Amino acid sequence: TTAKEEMERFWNKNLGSNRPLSPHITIYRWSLPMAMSICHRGTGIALSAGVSLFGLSALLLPGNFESHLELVKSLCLGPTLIYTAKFGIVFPLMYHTWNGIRHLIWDLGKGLTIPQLTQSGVVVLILTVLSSVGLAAM
Amino acid sequence: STQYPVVDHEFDAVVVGAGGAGLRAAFGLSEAGFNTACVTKLFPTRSHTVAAQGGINAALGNMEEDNWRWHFYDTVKGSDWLGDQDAIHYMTEQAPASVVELENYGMPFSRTEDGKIYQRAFGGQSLKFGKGGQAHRCCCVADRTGHSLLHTLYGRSLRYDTSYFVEYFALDLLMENGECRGVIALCIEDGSIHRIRARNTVVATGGYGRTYFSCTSAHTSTGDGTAMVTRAGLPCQDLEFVQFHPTGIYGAGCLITEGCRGEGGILINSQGERFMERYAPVAKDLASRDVVSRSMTLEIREGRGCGPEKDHVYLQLHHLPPEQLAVRLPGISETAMIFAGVDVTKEPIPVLPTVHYNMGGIPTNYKGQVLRHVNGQDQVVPGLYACGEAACASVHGANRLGANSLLDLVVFGRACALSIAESCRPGDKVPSIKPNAGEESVMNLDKLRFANGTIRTSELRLSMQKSMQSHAAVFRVGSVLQEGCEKILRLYGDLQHLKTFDRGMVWNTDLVETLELQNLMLCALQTIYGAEARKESRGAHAREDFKERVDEYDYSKPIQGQQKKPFQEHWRKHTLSYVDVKTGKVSLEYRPVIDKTLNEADCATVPPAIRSY
Amino acid sequence: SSKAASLHWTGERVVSVLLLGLLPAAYLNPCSAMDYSLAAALTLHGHWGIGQVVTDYVRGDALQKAAKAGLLALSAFTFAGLCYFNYHDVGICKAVAMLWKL
Amino acid sequence: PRIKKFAIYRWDPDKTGDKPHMQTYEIDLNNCGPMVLDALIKIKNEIDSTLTFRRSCREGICGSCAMNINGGNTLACTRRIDTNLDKVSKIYPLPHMYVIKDLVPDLSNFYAQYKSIEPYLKKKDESQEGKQQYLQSIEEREKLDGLYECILCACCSTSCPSYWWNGDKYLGPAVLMQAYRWMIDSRDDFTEERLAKLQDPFSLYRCHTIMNCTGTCPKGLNPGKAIAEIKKMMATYKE
Numbered sequence A: 001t002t003a004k005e006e007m008e009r010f011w012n013k014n015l016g017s018n019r020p021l022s023p024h025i026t027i028y029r030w031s032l033p034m035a036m037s038i039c040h041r042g043t044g045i046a047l048s049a050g051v052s053l054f055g056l057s058a059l060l061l062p063g064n065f066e067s068h069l070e071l072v073k074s075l076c077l078g079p080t081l082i083y084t085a086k087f088g089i090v091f092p093l094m095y096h097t098w099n100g101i102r103h104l105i106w107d108l109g110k111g112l113t114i115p116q117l118t119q120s121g122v123v124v125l126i127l128t129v130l131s132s133v134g135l136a137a138m
Numbered sequence B: 001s002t003q004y005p006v007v008d009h010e011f012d013a014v015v016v017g018a019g020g021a022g023l024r025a026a027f028g029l030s031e032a033g034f035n036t037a038c039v040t041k042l043f044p045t046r047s048h049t050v051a052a053q054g055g056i057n058a059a060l061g062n063m064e065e066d067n068w069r070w071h072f073y074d075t076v077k078g079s080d081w082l083g084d085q086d087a088i089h090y091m092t093e094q095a096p097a098s099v100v101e102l103e104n105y106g107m108p109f110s111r112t113e114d115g116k117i118y119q120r121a122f123g124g125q126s127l128k129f130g131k132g133g134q135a136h137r138c139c140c141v142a143d144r145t146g147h148s149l150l151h152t153l154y155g156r157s158l159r160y161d162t163s164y165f166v167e168y169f170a171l172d173l174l175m176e177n178g179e180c181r182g183v184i185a186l187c188i189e190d191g192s193i194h195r196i197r198a199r200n201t202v203v204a205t206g207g208y209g210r211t212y213f214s215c216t217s218a219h220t221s222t223g224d225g226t227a228m229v230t231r232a233g234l235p236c237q238d239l240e241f242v243q244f245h246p247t248g249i250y251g252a253g254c255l256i257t258e259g260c261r262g263e264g265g266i267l268i269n270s271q272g273e274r275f276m277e278r279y280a281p282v283a284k285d286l287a288s289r290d291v292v293s294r295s296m297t298l299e300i301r302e303g304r305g306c307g308p309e310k311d312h313v314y315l316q317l318h319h320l321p322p323e324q325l326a327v328r329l330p331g332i333s334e335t336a337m338i339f340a341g342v343d344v345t346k347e348p349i350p351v352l353p354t355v356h357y358n359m360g361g362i363p364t365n366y367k368g369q370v371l372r373h374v375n376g377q378d379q380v381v382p383g384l385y386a387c388g389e390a391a392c393a394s395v396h397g398a399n400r401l402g403a404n405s406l407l408d409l410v411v412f413g414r415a416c417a418l419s420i421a422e423s424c425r426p427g428d429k430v431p432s433i434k435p436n437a438g439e440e441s442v443m444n445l446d447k448l449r450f451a452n453g454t455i456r457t458s459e460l461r462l463s464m465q466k467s468m469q470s471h472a473a474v475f476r477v478g479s480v481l482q483e484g485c486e487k488i489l490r491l492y493g494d495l496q497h498l499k500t501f502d503r504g505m506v507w508n509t510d511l512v513e514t515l516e517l518q519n520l521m522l523c524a525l526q527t528i529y530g531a532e533a534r535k536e537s538r539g540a541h542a543r544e545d546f547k548e549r550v551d552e553y554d555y556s557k558p559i560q561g562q563q564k565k566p567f568q569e570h571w572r573k574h575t576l577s578y579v580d581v582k583t584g585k586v587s588l589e590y591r592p593v594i595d596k597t598l599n600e601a602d603c604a605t606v607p608p609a610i611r612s613y
Numbered sequence C: 001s002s003k004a005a006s007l008h009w010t011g012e013r014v015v016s017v018l019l020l021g022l023l024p025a026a027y028l029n030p031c032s033a034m035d036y037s038l039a040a041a042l043t044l045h046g047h048w049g050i051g052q053v054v055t056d057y058v059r060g061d062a063l064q065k066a067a068k069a070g071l072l073a074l075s076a077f078t079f080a081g082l083c084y085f086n087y088h089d090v091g092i093c094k095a096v097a098m099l100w101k102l
Numbered sequence D: 001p002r003i004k005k006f007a008i009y010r011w012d013p014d015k016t017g018d019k020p021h022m023q024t025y026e027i028d029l030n031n032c033g034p035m036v037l038d039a040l041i042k043i044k045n046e047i048d049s050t051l052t053f054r055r056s057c058r059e060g061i062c063g064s065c066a067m068n069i070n071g072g073n074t075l076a077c078t079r080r081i082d083t084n085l086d087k088v089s090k091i092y093p094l095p096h097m098y099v100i101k102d103l104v105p106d107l108s109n110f111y112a113q114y115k116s117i118e119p120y121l122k123k124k125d126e127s128q129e130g131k132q133q134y135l136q137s138i139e140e141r142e143k144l145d146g147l148y149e150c151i152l153c154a155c156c157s158t159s160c161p162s163y164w165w166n167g168d169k170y171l172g173p174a175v176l177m178q179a180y181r182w183m184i185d186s187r188d189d190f191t192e193e194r195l196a197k198l199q200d201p202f203s204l205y206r207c208h209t210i211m212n213c214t215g216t217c218p219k220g221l222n223p224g225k226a227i228a229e230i231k232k233m234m235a236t237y238k239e
């Protein structure tokens, strides 16, 4: 029996058996670092989708960008409502920008103790709300 | 029968046990080129030796210049001259060789200025044959040595083609006309029964602490190999000698290492007195285990109790440097806090002497061959070996020296491999076994699995445990031992009035713990009867009736003027206990210790002397 | 025994620090050259991003190849779009600026 | 009388039709020990002798106890019971693992991965081995602290979400930490080829510093940090 053969025979044993996989998301305790990793994935997917929607409209949809903005003004929405549209753009952008630095700090092998994840984690979370409210006010 | 499937395996050599003893024997056999199968009920890491904290002895001369012969003397003196010196010679000489082997396997030993394996003072070790003061030969991985030892031995065992039967409860030895053929084992995973046969069989199952109510050992230290030897009719040795480690948490009974006493730790009573200086003058609180804990159990019965209920004592690390505690002993720093809530830096640890090491086990050669006692002489059982706490070469004698058992593990595990390697080659025909062999072992399983009784396993285990705890304790008198002997005999007849519940095949922990109870009881019977039969005080076994050390001579005065006491009239001999399985009767015999060494000119025999550190 | 999987990881961190540097540089200096390099880093980083998600969730030999192909065609068409937007329209920087004062 | 409720996952493969379900046990805490396992042992011995689990030392060094109590992967002998009687303690088997029976997981693959990294000392020419102790400075010894202590309880690897999804191909923290444990071991000569063994998207690069491993470790170690330190070596090694 070898290492590779052990795994190879582990899978045959279980996948053809009436054994149940134990609960995981149903039961495992939610923590800030774990939940904040979920949001980083979400915001990444959310952002790239937006960027793709922007490119795949430059090649596909008619007109120019100035014509498109003049079509947004057609709805002449409330200044608060246009601020809400603006805030929902920067919020997922900023979170990912701040937490992205936190990931890059980690990659340097720095700030990887359990207290530090809740410290810098809040510091990312707080920087987010501030830089999003800050940028939407321009 | 026929309700069960049989799967007969064929191998060169079987090793029953995945501790340090078992692993070293297992992979060592594979290294010699043998088709070796290791049969273990636990995963190798989970094996107890992982709990070992103190260290591993070897006269490497890393702290001060040292001779392995000095280590020889200290082991035999500690054995209260029940230690067979042919085995001690072999162990103490291979000691440096075997340790340097482990450091080369990759065992992360602590280091010093020189970059050599850090050694430190330990329980009852001296230089210049007991004259040169304190000896520093305990090589350690800073309070987690057995953990590293087991992990590196296991780690290195993946280099070879050893077939690991992980989570397999071995039931009985495959036996035919005295000759051992291997083992019959239950596969915990699916309930199946497997007959693993070989030309040789190594038995390294470790001790049987769980016979008593309070021990330091694992829940799985159930003397299973001892029972397999028992049920084969083959004798057990010195099973009444049970080590009481002086320091263990008053609560759940977890261990606080003797390394605490070697690094500068002192034991404090109810008045705050350095009370070990009152008994031992030369070694003080770093004396032999058979005397230190017996001085402690004395203090409990005095009325000088040191606790909320005046039942336990203290181990003090109040005056120890906090800088040293972080480096040398971090494993006790956590476990004292978790099991008691004790800051090892500010507060003293509440300690109580409880069961730790089983001296006896399976009679064995210095080479490691299991012995039956025929015609008042010795006979090597063919293809049967034993090593570790499971065995009894009696390299420890009446009292095991501190940090020698992990050495005992490596050395004699290794020895078992060499004995097989030299006596026969791999590919030698495996002796074939009967079609209806180990048939009663399966029936012992089946009858127990569908057991309609009245006293469930858990209840009977406790009845055995607390009995041993008050009868076969630190001190023992004839009257108390006599009650204990028929009290333990009582519960053997109860071993059919037992009610089991779980009646499945896959992982019946209910069934295996009951099989463990049969093995624990078979251990218990021989343990208590040997103590009642022995009418002297020797090492760990101390009779209050006969506090005299009875030898072939009165070794207090010169040897010349006396005539030798007849062998059947003195008590310097090995207890050979047998027990009938059906009646539960403990009939026992005796055989002499070995005094001659492997070479007199290289290592002199140490004649019996006065016993006090 | 070439080390390709390690270099890919290093590459991903390199574009991250480049894209981190670009977002303030594009604010301070919003030029046509900044438009293209922003389109270059943005599409690449995201492509390697979703790539990580695909290797994580999309199990199976046959299904994973199609997902990687889909992601490649998507990223190609995205980078093409952004470059077309930089060349034949206002350009990312100036388009973002216009969108903001609205 | 101080009664505490325990909700425990139970599935018996020796009963046809029986599917996964919870079972509650009531226990007086003044009769019982302070640790979770003490309660698991108490109900096994007194209430229901079918609760099949793994236990050995009850000391926190063997790693049998590994299970998910109240959403966290720790040792049952290290987690002390919540004296809060208003709360019911939930005992579960280690997350996303094939249940053999009641809280007993199939760790075969987990061990099998550990075998693949070769957790033993490797010297380029060990024809002189066995006879002389290898030299190592006190400083080079500290480089191993926080790494060897790992008892392979499989709490950390089983807490990682990447190991939940890609357990087949990704090694997980437990195994990866030991890979590092042997990487900076000064005695080992095979440091370059050990890193080259991780040159694929799955073996090492399924880590995304989710950090559940460090957070759940019963022995207090930091597997993630050691993984992060591997990644750095993987980028900055010649040849």
Ligand SMILES: *Cc1cc2c(cc1C)nc1c(=O)[nH]c(=O)nc-1n2C[C@H](O)[C@H](O)[C@H](O)COP(=O)(O)OP(=O)(O)OC[C@H]1O[C@@H](n2cnc3c(N)ncnc32)[C@H](O)[C@@H]1O
Pocket: B016, B017, B018, B019, B020, B021, B022, B039, B040, B041, B042, B043, B044, B046, B047, B048, B049, B050, B051, B052, B053, B054, B055, B056, B145, B146, B168, B169, B170, B171, B204, B205, B206, B207, B216, B217, B218, B221, B224, B225, B255, B356, B357, B387, B388, B389, B390, B402, B403, B404, B405, B406, B407, B409
């Ligand atoms: C209890 C204890 C002992 C101890 C110690 C600390 C504690 C808490 N610290 C020590 C130390 O610092 N230095 C030292 O020299 N000794 C120390 N000790 C004593 C020593 O550790 C033990 O005597 C020794 O480790 C015993 O090891 P051994 O290899 O002989 O046995 P094991 O560790 O208990 O492993 C047993 C293996 O056998 C298998 N087994 C048991 N029964 C079966 C059956 N039924 N079928 C199949 N396999 C079986 C187990 O699976 C296990 O792997």
Ligand code: HEM
Pocket: A040, A041, A043, A044, A045, A047, A048, A049, A051, A096, A097, A100, A101, A103, A104, C016, C017, C019, C020, C021, C023, C042, C043, C045, C046, C047, C048, C049, C050, C052, C053, D207, D208, D209
């Ligand atoms: C300039 C600010 C940004 C920084 C610092 C940054 C950095 C990072 C890093 C380091 C990761 C990998 C996380 C890890 O270490 O495992 C990541 C993930 C990702 N990012 Fe960015 N990024 C930024 C902007 C963006 C933008 C604008 C987009 C949209 C086009 C984007 C899309 C993604 C995607 C799709 C992932 C994959 C999610 C994952 O693997 O978990 N990022 N980011």
Ligand SMILES: O=C(Nc1ccccc1)c1ccccc1I
Pocket: A025, A034, A037, A038, A041, C056, D161, D162, D165, D208, D210
């Ligand atoms: O799998 C992930 N989701 C997940 C995390 C926790 C619980 C459930 C799902 C995840 C999230 C972020 C980064 C990488 C990953 I592999």
Ligand code: SF4
Pocket: D149, D150, D151, D152, D153, D154, D155, D156, D157, D173, D174, D177, D213, D216, D217, D218, D219, D220, D221, D223
């Ligand atoms: S690093 Fe900690 S949590 Fe992970 S396997 Fe080792 S002991 Fe368990």
Ligand code: F3S
Pocket: D156, D159, D160, D161, D162, D172, D173, D206, D207, D208, D209, D210, D211, D212, D213, D214, D224, D227
């Ligand atoms: S929980 Fe995770 S993804 Fe990496 S940091 Fe730990 S293994």
Ligand code: FES
Pocket: D054, D055, D056, D057, D058, D059, D060, D061, D062, D063, D064, D065, D066, D075, D076, D077, D078
């Ligand atoms: S049983 Fe050994 S760690 Fe809990």
